[PDB]
Amino acid sequence: MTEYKLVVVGACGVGKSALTIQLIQNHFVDEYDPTIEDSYRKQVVIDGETCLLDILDTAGQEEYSAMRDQYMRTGEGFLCVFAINNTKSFEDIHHYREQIKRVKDSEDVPMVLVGNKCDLPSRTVDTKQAQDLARSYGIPFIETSAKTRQGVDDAFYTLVREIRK
Amino acid sequence: RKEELDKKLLEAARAGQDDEVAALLAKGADVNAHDTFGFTPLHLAALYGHLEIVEVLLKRGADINADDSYGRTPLHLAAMRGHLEIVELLLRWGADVNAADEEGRTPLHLAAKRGHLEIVEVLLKNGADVNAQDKFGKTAFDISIDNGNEDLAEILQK
Ligand SMILES: Nc1nc2c(ncn2[C@@H]2O[C@H](COP(=O)(O)OP(=O)(O)O)[C@@H](O)[C@H]2O)c(=O)[nH]1
Ligand SMILES: [Mg+2]
């Protein structure tokens, strides 16, 4: 089976670990450890084709990780997750994209903007702003909610499809 | 009352408060308490590099082969983080050197993938399967080949 390497990047607390655990084990975990950075492997069927997704659930970005460097150097796709109830994550998405483009040295990398925590009543990040930024960068935008699993599979499959094309 | 004391012990083990861990253990806290994913206080102490809390928990009677929701033992986390003293102490207390998680990854796999050569050689010295295949048919040598770690490949071969 073809192996696609994905990196779940973003700010701390946005929900990268929750999204990845929701995808691989179909349940929601709260108060997950914010410093453990583990790579998971998930066998999926997309458009009828079977693939293996190796997802780096990024964490501990303050320190240096050789595995994180290797993943970002050879990253086939990125989930630039941000929390809609947190403006700072939406601001740091640009810095993360700049770092990814610098390390990859490529003007076109498969990235997907993800707005987590859609279930929360607060909407401090407007959907219009995220849609406009995604359109400007020409990349899909999916709103997910690891607490209710609304769109986790859709977001990951969209990222895989972006990898394919 | 049980749950709150358990959570306080877990947060003290994670944060690295020897005085708080001692007070909570003397207060009746459960050493086998697990959070939502399953991290016991020994999981968090091995993960965060707190040698003293690891010693206190192992003396008090903390389970050393407990696994979280993904089947990772405290030895798994101590290997993935690169805490040589902690892995040596856990293996001294007879921690499973060939434990398998939900992907069937030996702590050797995590130590090799993260790039910690000293953890890899310590685990090999203490009886770790060099030719161990996970649930996706990969070994430590396969990890070294994929990551291009020449020193890790040399250590595994010899
Ligand atoms: N409602 C809701 N809460 C979330 C979601 N994702 C994460 N959380 C909460 O955020 C807290 C920590 O987020 P976490 O996943 O550890 O952040 P990360 O490790 O930086 O990706 C957890 O206690 C979750 O309850 C989501 O999609 N919806
Ligand atoms: Mg995380």
Numbering used by the authors:
A (entry chain B): 1 to 165
B (entry chain A): 163 to 320
Paper text:
A potential workaround to the size limitation in cryo-EM is to bind a small protein of interest (the “cargo”) to a much larger carrier (the “scaffold”) in order to make it large enough to visualize readily. In the present study, we demonstrate a protein design advance that substantially rigidifies a cryo-EM scaffold based on fusion of a DARPin as the modular binding domain to a designed protein cage. Analogous to antibodies, sequence variations in the nonconserved loop regions of a DARPin protein can be selected in the laboratory in order to obtain a variant that binds nearly any protein of interest. The rigidified scaffold described here provides a number of advantageous properties for cryo-EM structure determination—size, symmetry, and modular binding—making it suitable for future applications to many important systems.
KRAS is a 19-kDa GTPase involved in signal transduction in cell proliferation pathways. KRAS is among the most prevalent human oncogenes, with mutations in KRAS occurring in about 25% of all cancers. Drugs bound to a minor cleft region of the protein near that location are of key pharmaceutical interest, including covalent inhibitors targeting cysteine mutants (i.e., G12C or G13C). We therefore undertook a series of structural studies on known KRAS mutants, focusing on the degree of atomic interpretability in 3D density maps obtained using the cryo-EM scaffold described above; a DARPin with loop sequences that bind the GDP-bound form of KRAS was already known from prior work, enabling the scaffold to be readily repurposed to image GDP-bound KRAS structures. For imaging experiments, we investigated three different sequence variants of KRAS—single site mutants G12V, G12C, and G13C—in their GDP-bound forms. All three KRAS variants were found to bind with good occupancy to our cryo-EM scaffold (presenting the KRAS-specific DARPin). For the G12C mutant, the resolution was 2.2 Å for the entire particle and 3.0 Å around the KRAS protein. The maps and refined KRAS structures were all closely comparable, with significant differences in the maps occurring only at the mutated amino acid side chains, as anticipated. As an assessment of coordinate precision, the rms deviation between the two most closely related cryo-EM structures (the G12V and G12C mutants) was 0.58 Å; this is slightly less than the differences when compared to previously reported X-ray crystal structure, which are between 0.73 and 1.1 Å.
